[PDB]
Amino acid sequence: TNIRKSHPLMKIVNNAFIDLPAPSNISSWWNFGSLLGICLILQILTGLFLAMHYTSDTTTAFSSVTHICRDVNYGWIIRYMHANGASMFFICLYMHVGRGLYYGSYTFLETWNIGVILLLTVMATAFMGYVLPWGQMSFWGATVITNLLSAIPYIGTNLVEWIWGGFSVDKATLTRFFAFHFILPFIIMAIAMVHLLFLHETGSNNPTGISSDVDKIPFHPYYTIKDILGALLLILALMLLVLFAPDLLGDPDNYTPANPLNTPPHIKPEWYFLFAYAILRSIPNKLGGVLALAFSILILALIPLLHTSKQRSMMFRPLSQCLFWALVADLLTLTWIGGQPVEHPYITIGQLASVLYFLLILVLMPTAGTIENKLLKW
Amino acid sequence: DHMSIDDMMFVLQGQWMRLCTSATESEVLRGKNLLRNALVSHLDGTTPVCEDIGRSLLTYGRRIPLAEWESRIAEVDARVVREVCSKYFYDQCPAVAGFGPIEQLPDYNRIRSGMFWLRF
Amino acid sequence: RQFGHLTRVRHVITYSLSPFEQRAFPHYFSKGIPNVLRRTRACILRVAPPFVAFYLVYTWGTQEFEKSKRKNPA
Amino acid sequence: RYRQLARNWVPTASLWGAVGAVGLVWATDDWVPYINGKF
Amino acid sequence: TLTARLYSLLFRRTSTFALTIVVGALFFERAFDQGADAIYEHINEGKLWKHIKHKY
Amino acid sequence: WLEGIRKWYYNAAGFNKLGLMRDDTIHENDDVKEAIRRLPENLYNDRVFRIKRALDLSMRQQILPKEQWTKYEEDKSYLEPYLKEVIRERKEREEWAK
Amino acid sequence: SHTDIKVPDFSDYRRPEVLDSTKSSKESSEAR
Amino acid sequence: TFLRWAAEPEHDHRKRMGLKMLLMMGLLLPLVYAMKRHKWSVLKSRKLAYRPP
Ligand SMILES: CCCCCCCCCCCCCCCCCC(=O)OC[C@H](COP(=O)([O-])OCC(O)COP(=O)([O-])OC[C@@H](COC(=O)CCCCCCCCCCCCCCCCC)OC(=O)CCCCCCCCCCCCCCCCC)OC(=O)CCCCCCCCCCCCCCCCC
Ligand SMILES: CCCCC/C=C/C/C=C/CCCCCCCC(=O)O[C@H](COC(=O)CCCCCCCCCCCCCCC)COP(=O)(O)OCC[N+](C)(C)C
Ligand SMILES: CCCCCCCC/C=C/CCCCCCCC(=O)O[C@H](COC(=O)CCCCCCCCCCC)COP(=O)(O)OCCN
Ligand SMILES: CCCCCCCC/C=C/CCCCCCCC(=O)O[C@H](COC(=O)CCCCCCCCCCC)COP(=O)(O)OCCN
Ligand SMILES: CCCCCCCC/C=C\CCCCCCCC(=O)O[C@H](COC(=O)CCCCCCCCCCC)COP(=O)(O)OCCN
Ligand code: HEM
Ligand code: HEM
Ligand SMILES: CCCCCCCCCCCCO[C@@H]1O[C@H](CO)[C@@H](O[C@H]2O[C@H](CO)[C@@H](O)[C@H](O)[C@H]2O)[C@H](O)[C@H]1O
């Protein structure tokens, strides 16, 4: 009969992206999945090009990057794209996770935990990529952060030294981070394949939170056009940065070569890790700060069990909605705090923001679910 | 069957498309012969013929001799079938009605994209 | 599961129109502006409050950092 | 009643706990004689 | 209408719709480049090397 | 009173604005699946419709006229009886298996 | 009877070229 | 001025592209948006009718 439905390869693509029954009513918040895919492809291409020109020796590395920006043809636009690209990826990631929380998409457990892993994996990737230029921030950032694994009792010191491949972040660390940074996106692609595979078992959630089988529509052309529109908007955004403001989201110390003898005035990681930096910095004790940092991320994995509401989505849950936006604003605050030096009043703002964060996820929004239930006579 | 609606629609539109773009001489000869037989054999006995007279005068304002019909059919060829079918079918918007377990009945947009071919 | 056995629905009539029979932007501002206002009034008391508080904690704490870096007469 | 009248995985998970202990200790490399007892 | 003239002439046959688009992209590339360029180089009168190079 | 708050909350929740009843919004676990499955033709098709309606409105970012909103007083728990019994049954099989 | 289904009024969404219920829409088909 | 150029030789080229990107997006964003509305018009317009016996 029809090739799109039969052929072993075309069937999959058809089932996945053409004839897939999508809900009628998914919002712009469902754009982010496709956009994340784009982010991922974007990084791989721009990445691949950069890697045809870059070197991972301590001595050559900083200059090889600037060489891309001065002497390689269009090397500049490629490089700034891959860097703003990384920001756009984390925006897409945090938007995507947002939708998960608000609309109760995390009920799709397998899909969700894969997703947590995607997040961790992209985090590792971007952490190691930022080291690759070998700027002041790159170097001192990578040093402080990797050192946290020293706080692991018994094995900490040994473990951090084995990661490094020596006694500090040095030649061997950079060369291995280059390697890891290259192969990780590949593994992200597969995990993402799987991420989708599980999603395709249930089909999508929607903003009502109510099953939508009585009103599905073929993906193509409704959602083909709509994803494209979204991708345009992503490109609009990406290029606004690259072409008007390429350095807006970065730190200038990363234009100053890495120098093991002179520590920068304020050490920060990239903005997309600032909320977690600020949680870590709130705890006096170093292993405490480590376990808090890890929990600020891994808690994502627990949120499924903390669901109390009889309704899936927050659409009809006013009290929960307020708390959700509280969490969002708190994360904006945690980010602000994490970009700030450890002084009054920020030390105390940070401590509070850190408390608020865990308080919301583990106690307040569970409760609210339940209060709402009673307000509805169930 | 509740599960064949899409497949059915696809093959059917494919037929319209094929006739618009690529109808063969031979199959047109066949279509001619079908319609020839249809017209002759329908007008058989007093009632069908009485109706033909009656309706014809209302619709064409006269009765059309069988021999006239035949010379208009003889006119039709591959090119004519292609050309005419394109006028009415190729890249035009259909009207659609379904009743029953029509859960699988192609979305209107998909139906409309089926009224042309990217290859032509 | 694909279109054909998603679910069981009885007695529902869907009427619609070709895109080529219709305007892309029916009454875009005359209906749309009011609708957007309606949409915003609906959510702002849930969404805006936190961001107000952010702006305030950020205003205050930025200026508390200002003050503490100055000298005071003593 | 009938779970608790399970708890038949307690002696099997005892033997699996020794597999976990002895397994981590083999993969990682004193008071076991001969093996490593004589470095 | 103009659009009618265009539809029947260019867009009905899909082979033709394609031929239209490649040819039009050609003239659009040249036109858009030339015009935007002139827009930039008037916004930045005097400041570009190509404006001052006559001096050396 | 308690009921004063509950009524305010109902209007805040806002599912009523899409012409849904409370029971339409319950998240479908296995128990709920089954309760739906035991619904009589009248009650089932009605639900099918209310949701078609709401979903189509969700798409448009629209609501109904106030005249058409589901009234706090008129919202019957159509599902509870079916569901209370599905759950009674489950609890029974649990009990038994210990 | 089913004969008392009448199709709702689409006036609001129609292209202006197709508003006239007493004119062929085929005049405007090439345009549209 | 020289120190800016030294740090970012691309300053002028980038700004030229910025202009061309803004222009193309001015075209493409309403265009594709229009395409979206067209396809979706089928759905936006649709009227629902429940008709049990
Ligand atoms: C006191 C003085 C000091 C002030 C401080 C105190 C603060 C007080 C005020 C309170 C402020 C906080 C509260 C937030 C606002 C209030 C609530 C509100 O937003 O109500 C909306 C409310 C939401 O509707 P709903 O139906 O309830 O729910 C929405 C649905 O879930 C889904 O809706 P849909 O499916 O119909 O899709 C449409 C939707 C789509 O929504 C989404 O997808 C969300 C995000 C995408 C935006 C929309 C798509 C356009 C693409 C944007 C990016 C492209 C490049 C442009 C440059 C980016 C700008 C930096 O668009 C929107 O809803 C627009 C809202 C986007 C807000 C983004 C927040 C800004 C970030 C700032 C971070 C802070 C740090 C600053 C640093 C600067 C940067 C380096 O409804 C409406 O307003 C109607 C929605 C339709 C849009 C109307 C027309 C707007 C045009 C949209 C495109 C442009 C948007 C702007 C994006 C970026 C601007 C910076
Ligand atoms: C030539 C060498 C290139 C090698 C790589 C392969 C590329 C493929 C094509 C390249 C050349 C450009 C010609 C484009 C062909 C025409 C498209 C087409 O034929 O099909 C359109 C799909 O494109 C749409 O939507 C388009 C809207 C979305 C935007 C996507 C456009 C793709 C741009 C092409 C990229 C060029 C690559 C340059 C690299 C150096 C269909 O749209 P409609 O359903 O409304 O039409 C209905 C059919 N009617 C009008 C004939 C009745
Ligand atoms: C380790 C991960 C940590 C946890 C993850 C936290 C996620 C970070 C947050 C990013 C934003 C996520 C978006 C959440 C989903 C959006 C829900 C939503 O749109 O709610 C709107 C109000 O919209 C609006 O008012 C839309 C305005 C959008 C506000 C911009 C967000 C600010 C970014 C802050 C960055 C740090 C009401 O919509 P509904 O209830 O669907 O009702 C629609 C109308 N009937
Ligand atoms: C497999 C093919 C992939 C192609 C992807 C298709 C892109 C679809 C969307 C396009 C967005 C429209 C806006 C683009 C503006 C282009 C304007 C322009 O000509 O700018 C380019 C640079 O722009 C630019 O370089 C801007 C381009 C922005 C596109 C980025 C998104 C894709 C990421 C690529 C990463 C690997 C060069 O201008 P000039 O140097 O003056 O050259 C003169 C003309 N040759
Ligand atoms: C130790 C340090 C502390 C500092 C923390 C800073 C960060 C967060 C701060 C503040 C967020 C407060 C949000 C409260 C606003 C809620 C009340 C309100 O304005 O809107 C209610 C929503 O109802 C409802 O939602 C009912 C009211 C229930 C709201 C619960 C409040 C809890 C918020 C979290 C506080 C951390 C009414 O609005 P709608 O129902 O939308 O209808 C509008 C027309 N009446
Ligand atoms: C999730 C995908 C990826 C992310 C998030 C990512 C992130 C990053 C980040 C943040 C940087 C530092 C950018 C800077 O400020 O200079 C970077 C640099 C780099 N990345 Fe990636 N990257 C990804 C994929 C890839 C891939 C697949 C490759 C190569 C195959 C690659 C090659 C490079 C190279 C060579 C650099 C050094 C040049 C530079 O600094 O711009 N990246 N990456
Ligand atoms: C590389 C990163 C990721 C990619 C490429 C990706 C890809 C996608 C895609 C294509 C979809 C379907 C479209 C959509 O509904 O937005 C999707 C849905 C989903 N993803 Fe992700 N995702 C990523 C990360 C994550 C993360 C970090 C989480 C959670 C922590 C997550 C959880 C989900 C969930 C729950 C859905 C279903 C949403 C729904 O149907 O309502 N994903 N993802
Ligand atoms: C309000 C009382 C009246 C007199 C003081 C008026 C000044 C304004 C109030 C804050 C006083 C500053 O005194 C205090 O200093 C310490 C040290 O940096 C900071 O506080 C912090 O101290 C250490 C920082 O390493 C943390 O262990 C502790 O958990 C945290 O509270 C705050 O900034 C402030 O709580």
Ligand SMILES: CC1=NC2=C(COCC2)C(=O)[C@@H]1c1ccc(Oc2ccc(OC(F)(F)F)cc2)cc1
């Ligand atoms: C499948 C899918 N289901 C749903 C929605 C929306 O909700 C409904 C379900 C979607 O938006 C999507 C989707 C996802 C990706 C995409 O475009 C790609 C494809 C591949 C790609 O590279 C990669 F490495 F990932 F393979 C990068 C982008 C288009 C569409």
